[PDB]
Design a protein around this ligand. Structure first.
Ligand SMILES: [Ca+2]
Length: 172
């Protein structure tokens, strides 16, 4: 029926790998700038080599995993769309920073998408934005966005840029 940005909904919970455990996943901003009350927009390097800034999305720090969970029961979600990448605001000091093992989209406990298959070496600061367009099973109740930091969480500014559902209904 219409597109509904995930950042325009409330999550059930949203964990992240940051050292400051009272920081929170950010709506429409990358994680660290967002928590620092900066206006900085989410931005990624695209396949065509340009940097795109996004109006909407989610910013987290990858964890073991970081898990952002939505109740989509009754909402008639048929599609999930997002770009995935490390936000340009991350500081890629060296190979140890901004290195994410994988990102998964999970629906009612089942992984329906993982970067691991096309991205066997994970994501890093140089990885171009990953375009994800997914069919969502009918009558689904829970959708989770999981990002896996691997060895360390340093610089793992994971953003789900322009993350939105196609949905028929009202959300809980
Ligand atoms: Ca990492």
């Amino acid at each position: 029926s219409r597109d509904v940005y995930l950042s325009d909904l409330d999550w059930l919970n949203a964990t992240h790998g940051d050292d400051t455990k009272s920081k929170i996943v950010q709506k429409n901003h990358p994680f660290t700038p967002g928590n620092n009350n900066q206006s900085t927009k989410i931005s990624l390097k695209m396949e065509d080599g340009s940097i795109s800034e996004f109006e909407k999305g989610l910013g987290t720090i990858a964890g073991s995993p970081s898990t952002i969970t939505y109740d989509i029961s009754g909402a008639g979600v048929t599609k999930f769309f997002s770009y995935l990448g490390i936000d340009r605001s991350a500081n890629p000091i060296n190979e140890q920073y901004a290195k994410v093992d994988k990102i998964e989209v999970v629906v009612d406990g089942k992984v329906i998408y993982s970067t691991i298959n096309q991205f066997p070496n994970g994501l890093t600061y140089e990885t171009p934005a990953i375009k994800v367009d997914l069919n969502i099973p009918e009558n689904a109740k829970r959708l989770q966005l999981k990002s896996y930091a691997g060895e360390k969480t340093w610089g793992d500014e994971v953003v789900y840029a322009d993350a939105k559902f196609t949905a028929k209904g009202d959300f809980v």
